[PDB]
Design an enzyme around this catalytic site. Structure first.
Site, PDB file in Angstrom:
ATOM      1  N   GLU A  35       8.445  17.536  16.200  1.00 52.62           N
ATOM      2  CA  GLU A  35       8.731  17.303  17.612  1.00 52.62           C
ATOM      3  C   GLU A  35       7.512  17.449  18.517  1.00 52.62           C
ATOM      4  OE1 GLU A  35      11.154  15.859  19.056  1.00 52.62           O
ATOM      5  OE2 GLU A  35      12.325  15.809  17.206  1.00 52.62           O
ATOM      6  N   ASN A  46      10.306   9.430  28.929  1.00 49.57           N
ATOM      7  CA  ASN A  46      10.942   8.271  28.332  1.00 49.57           C
ATOM      8  C   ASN A  46      11.248   7.408  29.539  1.00 49.57           C
ATOM      9  OD1 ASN A  46      11.476   9.394  25.443  1.00 49.57           O
ATOM     10  ND2 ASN A  46      12.382  10.953  26.774  1.00 49.57           N
ATOM     11  N   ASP A  49      15.268   5.714  30.151  1.00 47.27           N
ATOM     12  CA  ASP A  49      16.341   6.348  30.906  1.00 47.27           C
ATOM     13  C   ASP A  49      15.827   7.414  31.863  1.00 47.27           C
ATOM     14  OD1 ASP A  49      15.888   8.021  28.510  1.00 47.27           O
ATOM     15  OD2 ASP A  49      17.598   9.175  29.279  1.00 47.27           O
ATOM     16  N   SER A  51      14.015  10.131  31.570  1.00 49.19           N
ATOM     17  CA  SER A  51      14.204  11.513  31.152  1.00 49.19           C
ATOM     18  C   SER A  51      12.892  11.996  30.543  1.00 49.19           C
ATOM     19  CB  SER A  51      15.323  11.590  30.107  1.00 49.19           C
ATOM     20  OG  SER A  51      14.993  10.837  28.944  1.00 49.19           O
ATOM     21  N   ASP A  53      11.222  14.880  27.545  1.00 51.00           N
ATOM     22  CA  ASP A  53      11.479  15.805  26.447  1.00 51.00           C
ATOM     23  C   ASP A  53      10.449  16.916  26.691  1.00 51.00           C
ATOM     24  OD1 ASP A  53      13.234  13.863  25.179  1.00 51.00           O
ATOM     25  OD2 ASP A  53      11.402  12.843  24.503  1.00 51.00           O
ATOM     26  N   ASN A  60      15.546  17.245  25.778  1.00 56.49           N
ATOM     27  CA  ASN A  60      15.685  16.213  26.796  1.00 56.49           C
ATOM     28  C   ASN A  60      16.395  16.619  28.106  1.00 56.49           C
ATOM     29  OD1 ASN A  60      17.435  13.620  27.815  1.00 56.49           O
ATOM     30  ND2 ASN A  60      15.466  12.962  26.985  1.00 56.49           N
TER      31      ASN A  60
END
Length: 130
Positions: A35, A46, A49, A51, A53, A60
């Protein structure tokens, strides 16, 4: 903060992650590795959408924490996404637990699926005395 492999393993174990909801320490180590590469201040926007992480587990914004800028998001861990960028992972570990108290479990994270499921994860905790 960028954890060393065995350094992370002891900390996760100390935080009650060994077998939390059926998930072994080596599975969590494998997730973190893929990750963020053990990096607590890793972030990923991202653009799709809108968002982001956050942190060592790459949690998220749309579902788990509040950053105020993700459209129609939710805050299940009831944390500010800044809480997930600390050198002290206690809150990030508490939120990763909330995530796995969901139907999919560790499967929530697609990278776990791609690089840990049906892969030998034992190599991530070898020699760490955990």
């Amino acid at each position: 903060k960028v954890f060393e492999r065995c350094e992370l393993a002891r900390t996760l174990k100390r935080l009650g992650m060994d077998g939390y909801r059926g998930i072994s320490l080596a599975n969590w180590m494998c997730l973190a590795k893929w990750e963020s590469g053990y990096n607590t201040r890793a972030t990923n926007y991202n653009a799709g959408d809108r968002s982001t992480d956050y942190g060592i587990f790459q949690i998220n914004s749309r579902y788990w924490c509040n950053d105020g800028k993700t459209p129609g998001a939710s805050n299940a861990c009831h944390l500010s996404c800044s809480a997930l960028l600390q050198d002290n992972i206690a809150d990030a570990v508490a939120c990763a637990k909330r995530v796995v108290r969901d139907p999919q479990g560790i499967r929530a994270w697609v990278a776990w699926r791609n690089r840990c499921q049906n892969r030998d994860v034992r190599q991530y905790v070898q020699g760490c005395g955990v």
